[PDB]
């Protein structure tokens, strides 16, 4: 059971590097005890080896993560960026991907990961919802994301 709270959702200031985005989004998970204390270091080392950026169509998406051994409780942290931040395309691509929205996934089970990639593909495909994410505030994007994953969960079963 993944834990999604308002505290995990946040807006990030401009002129912020990818490293700082990782540490900032992992900070609430570390404080809650959802992950290990140095969870951000394993995420960025994973991020350098395997790019997690996805192009989509309205906005860009990032899916940072790490091995399941470091995660203690399943969680998800969402970050909204005021200006596009460079992220390398997942799967391998020379041209960079301008990622506006970042989805940090901490999952303790390897088999659950594929289902959460399918949830993410579903929500990011909606062109109007991705572009409305930017204008909505933290509480508005949290409730919309919560409602959509809850809707997606009842459709999965």
């Amino acid at each position, epitope marked *: 059971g993944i834990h999604f709270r308002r505290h995990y959702v946040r807006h990030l200031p401009k002129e912020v590097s990818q490293n700082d985005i990782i540490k900032a989004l992992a900070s609430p998970l570390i404080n809650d005890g959802m992950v290990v204390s140095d969870f951000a270091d394993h995420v960025i080392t994973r991020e350098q*080896n*395997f790019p*997690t950026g996805l192009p989509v169509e309205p906005v860009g998406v990032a*899916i940072p*993560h790490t*091995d*399941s051994k470091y995660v203690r409780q399943n969680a998800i942290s969402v970050g909204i960026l005021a200006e596009p931040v460079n992220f390398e395309d*997942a*799967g*391998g691509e020379p041209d960079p991907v301008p990622v506006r929205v970042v989805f940090m996934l901490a999952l303790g*089970n*390897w*088999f659950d*990961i*594929t*289902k959460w*990639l*399918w949830y993410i*593909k579903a929500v990011i495909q909606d062109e109007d919802f991705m572009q409305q994410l930017l204008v909505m505030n933290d509480d508005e994007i949290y409730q919309s994301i919560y409602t959509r994953i809850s809707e997606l969960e009842v*459709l*999965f079963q």
Partner: antibody, heavy 124, light 109 residues
């Protein structure tokens, strides 16, 4: 439909290195897991592990963590299993299996689509 | 490690009869992450049922799955010549997946 085509039969000497390929002709398996199941002569199926192609995140069964390595290429839709220091015990038939998809492409978790299998013989 | 044991080892039945296959786990299978496969000589294993009871696409109405926790069952209401094969159960609730020993169903004469 979506199908998985594996490499041909291989006979290798003890202490050699093996590499098996599995291409998904049908569709991109980037979103779904790709697992490897072996079966030794007169025995049952055995789960070696799997790879998440888009993320590149592998999972190894504790029995195969040391000598087996999984990988996958998303541009050619082909997965690979490497095994160094082949043994007589490694003689088996090796299967690749893509994760099944439910209605509207929901990943079920089980291995829905299977390759035809590759016979691997280790002998002097 | 989650270990799976299947019973019986060999099930001897005639077409038209009802087949019951048992799969038991040492620990509770997480989220009922179990699957039933059918393996015939010279063919790749065919997925029959995923999860506790969910049926894979294309499988006839005969095959049905039941169970939760540590006990699980595969039931074939009606048997036909095609159904005679070896059947495996696999769990994917643990951190790594494991298979069962398998149960062979054979024609009885």
């Amino acid at each position: 439909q979506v199908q998985l085509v594996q490499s041909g039969p291989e006979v290798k000497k003890p202490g050699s290195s093996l590499k098996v390929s599995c291409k998904a002709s049908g569709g991109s398996f980037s979103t779904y897991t790709l697992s490897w199941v072996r079966q030794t002569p007169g025995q049952g199926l055995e789960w070696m592990g799997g790879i998440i192609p888009l993320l590149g995140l592998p999972n190894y069964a504790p029995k195969f963590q040391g000598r087996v390595t999984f990988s996958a290429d998303t541009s050619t839709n082909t997965a690979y299993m490497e095994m160094s220091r082949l043994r007589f015990e490694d003689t088996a038939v090796y299967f690749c299996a893509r994760e099944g998809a439910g209605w509207f492409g929901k990943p079920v978790g089980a291995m829905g689509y299977w390759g035809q299998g590759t016979t691997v013989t280790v002998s002097s | 490690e989650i270990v799976l044991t299947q019973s019986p080892d060999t099930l001897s039945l005639s077409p038209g009869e009802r087949a019951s296959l048992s799969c038991r786990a040492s620990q509770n299978v997480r989220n009922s992450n179990l699957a039933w496969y059918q393996h015939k000589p010279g063919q790749p294993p065919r997925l029959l049922i995923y999860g506790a009871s969910s049926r894979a696409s294309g499988i006839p109405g005969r095959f049905s799955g039941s169970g939760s926790g540590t006990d699980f069952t595969l039931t074939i209401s009606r048997l036909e010549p095609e159904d005679f094969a070896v059947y495996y159960c696999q769990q994917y609730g643990g951190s790594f997946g494991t298979f069962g020993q398998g149960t062979k169903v054979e024609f009885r004469r």
